[PDB]
Design a protein around this nucleic acid. Structure first.
Ligand SMILES: Nc1ncnc2c1ncn2[C@@H]1O[C@H](COP(=O)(O)OP(=O)(O)OP(O)(O)=S)[C@@H](O)[C@H]1O
Ligand SMILES: [Mg+2]
Length: 163
DNA sequence: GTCAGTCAGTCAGTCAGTCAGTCAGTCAGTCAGTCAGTCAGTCAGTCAGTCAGTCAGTCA
């Protein structure tokens, strides 16, 4: 039809979804809307992993394209941290130092709100055995079997990546 | 005892068979003379910790 449509993805309800495609074509649109939809339902905060640190200095305008989705309530960023009507929205950090984070309490998670997990022809960015790095990330955002649902999202379809 | 001979040994003659030098393709051998990926240094650039400069939340 018109845009990226996560309805079937949300429907078939894997505890861990895995979608690919639509480079910039809303593959991030609906999935950045969804955490704020959980916030309007008043659920839990989300976790935003980043590939590296400079990628963080410019990305504070993460809610610009979801206002036209939900003009109603307040969706802003105070700085590094995201605030919806002033309540904490996203725990936003690149990869380098998640270990120092992993002793902190992380009681509230809603959904995986990152994409371009893996870039085509890009392994200089990569970290050795980062598949187990995502394992540490998930177990340090797990408290039970609930509150979490994950997605992968690569720009294109390949059959060579280790995952 | 002459005329001089007319059917076997005899020697003038081969006559196809014979040995083995002598070049000879040729033989893969081979070993060595040519040549094609292999790595080390150095060139440009990616990480994630510094400096250390600065608009600004709690106060004079
Ligand atoms: N529900 C929607 N309403 C309007 N536009 C949408 C919708 N879903 C997707 N889009 C389109 O998606 C675009 C932005 O999507 P993105 O968030 O960039 O997706 P993306 O594929 O992650 O690209 P990047 O690399 O993350 S910026 C918009 O400009 C629209 O063209
Ligand atoms: Mg995206």
């Amino acid at each position: 039809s018109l845009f990226y449509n996560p309805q079937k993805m949300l429907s078939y309800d894997r505890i861990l979804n895995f979608v690919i495609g639509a480079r910039g074509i809303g593959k991030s649109y609906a999935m950045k809307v969804y955490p704020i939809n959980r916030f309007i339902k008043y659920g839990e905060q989300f976790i935003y992993v980043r590939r590296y640190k400079p990628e963080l200095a410019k990305v504070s305008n993460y809610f610009n394209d979801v206002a036209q989705e939900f003009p109603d309530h307040e969706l802003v960023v105070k700085g590094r941290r995201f605030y919806i009507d002033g309540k904490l929205a996203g725990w936003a950090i690149p990869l380098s130092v998640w270990q120092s984070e992993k002793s902190n309490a992380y009681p509230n998670v809603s959904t995986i709100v990152f994409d371009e997990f893996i870039r085509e022809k890009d392994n200089s960015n990569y970290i050795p055995n980062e598949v187990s790095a995502l394992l540490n990330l998930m177990d340090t955002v797990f408290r039970n079997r609930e509150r979490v649902r994950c997605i992968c999202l690569s720009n294109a379809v390949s059959v060579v990546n280790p995952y």
